[PDB]
From Swiss-Prot:
Compartments (UniProt record): Cytoplasm, Cytosol; Chromosome
Family as reported in the entry's similarity comment: Belongs to the DDI1 family.
Gene: DDI2
Residues of the full protein shown: 1 to 76 of 399
Coiled coil: none
Domain of life where this protein originates: Eukaryota
Species of provenance: Homo sapiens
Protein's name in the database: Protein DDI1 homolog 2
Length: 97
């Protein structure tokens, strides 16, 4: 005697979506030749305030001990969004510690 059955489970995916985002390149320079460059995914309306915090996170050096420059000018206004600086996909910023 005996009563057994078989069972299974499975999962699938379909479709593709990317939303709306953009990639910016960051080049962090230390005079100690510990300079590094990377890129970050951000929203168009992302604050410069939040963007510099992401730069601090990935670079491992405080934003408080550095300044960030774009189009040869420092980005002084934390309350400007990246799109308002014209910082669009593929553009590059330079951080100086």
């Amino acid at each position: 005697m005996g009563h057994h059955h078989h069972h299974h489970h499975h999962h699938h995916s379909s479709g593709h979506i990317e939303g709306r985002h953009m990639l910016l390149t960051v080049y962090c320079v230390r005079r100690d030749l510990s300079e590094v460059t990377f890129s970050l995914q951000v929203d168009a309306d992302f604050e410069l305030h939040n963007f510099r915090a992401l730069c601090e996170l990935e670079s491992g050096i405080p934003a408080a001990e550095s300044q960030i420059v774009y189009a040869e000018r420092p980005l002084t206004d934390n309350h400007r969004s990246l799109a308002s600086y014209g910082l669009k996909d593929g553009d590059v910023v330079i951080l100086r510690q």
